[PDB]
Amino acid sequence: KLPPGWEKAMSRSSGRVYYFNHITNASQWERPSGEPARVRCSHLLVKHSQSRRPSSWRQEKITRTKEEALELINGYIQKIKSGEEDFESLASQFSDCSSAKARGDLGAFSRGQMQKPFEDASFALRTGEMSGPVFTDSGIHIILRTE
Ligand SMILES: O=C(O)CCC(=O)c1cccs1
Ligand SMILES: [Cl-]
């Protein structure tokens, strides 16, 4: 049937079927079609007051709530998916990670290096695919698999 990680779902507003990935939190209308030692990813991080280090190059003291951080992430995802904004542009401007200065690029990595939710989402993404919101101890991430 469906590839692992994917499940069929129903739009509440339209009744149209869609597909949801519970490892990446990605959702899409089309049926996903069915692992390497290493992947390369970029990401955009939004931190919140409960982040492991609630501070970034953008803000000495990060005070936003987790719910506020999720709303910002959701808004960035909308603009990326509509093409109004580029992932790399939003990461350079608004990512609370030091990788913002590199358009969010993390380089290549193996399993066992990254926090587990981030690692699992990165390796379940197809090349070129974007995640939905991914939660870690650092905050909330949008992940783009580039290689
Ligand atoms: O933070 C850690 O414990 C390991 C590195 C890690 O997971 C990430 C750093 C940038 C994106 S996710
Ligand atoms: Cl804010």
From Swiss-Prot:
GO BP annotations, alphabetical order: cellular response to hypoxia; negative regulation of amyloid-beta formation; negative regulation of cell motility; negative regulation of ERK1 and ERK2 cascade; negative regulation of protein binding; negative regulation of protein catabolic process; negative regulation of SMAD protein signal transduction; negative regulation of transforming growth factor beta receptor signaling pathway
PpiC domain sequence ranges: 36-147
Subcellular location: Nucleus; Nucleus speckle; Cytoplasm
Keywords: Acetylation, Cell cycle, Cytoplasm, Isomerase, Nucleus, Phosphoprotein, Rotamase
Post-translational modification: Phosphorylation at Ser-55 by DAPK1 results in inhibition of its catalytic activity, nuclear localization, and its ability to induce centrosome amplification, chromosome instability and cell transformation. Ser-55 is dephosphorylated upon IL33-stimulation of dendritic cells.
Consequence of substituting K47A: Loss of peptidyl-prolyl cis/trans isomerase activity. No effect on the interaction with IRAK3/IRAK-M. Abolishes IL33-mediated increase of IRAK3/IRAK-M protein levels
CDD domains, per database record: WW
Main subcellular location of this protein, as a coarse class: nucleus
Domains: entry comment: The WW domain is required for the interaction with STIL and KIF20B.
Role, per record: Peptidyl-prolyl cis/trans isomerase (PPIase) that binds to and isomerizes specific phosphorylated Ser/Thr-Pro (pSer/Thr-Pro) motifs. By inducing conformational changes in a subset of phosphorylated proteins, acts as a molecular switch in multiple cellular processes. Displays a preference for acidic residues located N-terminally to the proline bond to be isomerized. Regulates mitosis presumably by interacting with NIMA and attenuating its mitosis-promoting activity. Down-regulates kinase activity of BTK.
Descriptive protein name: Peptidyl-prolyl cis-trans isomerase NIMA-interacting 1
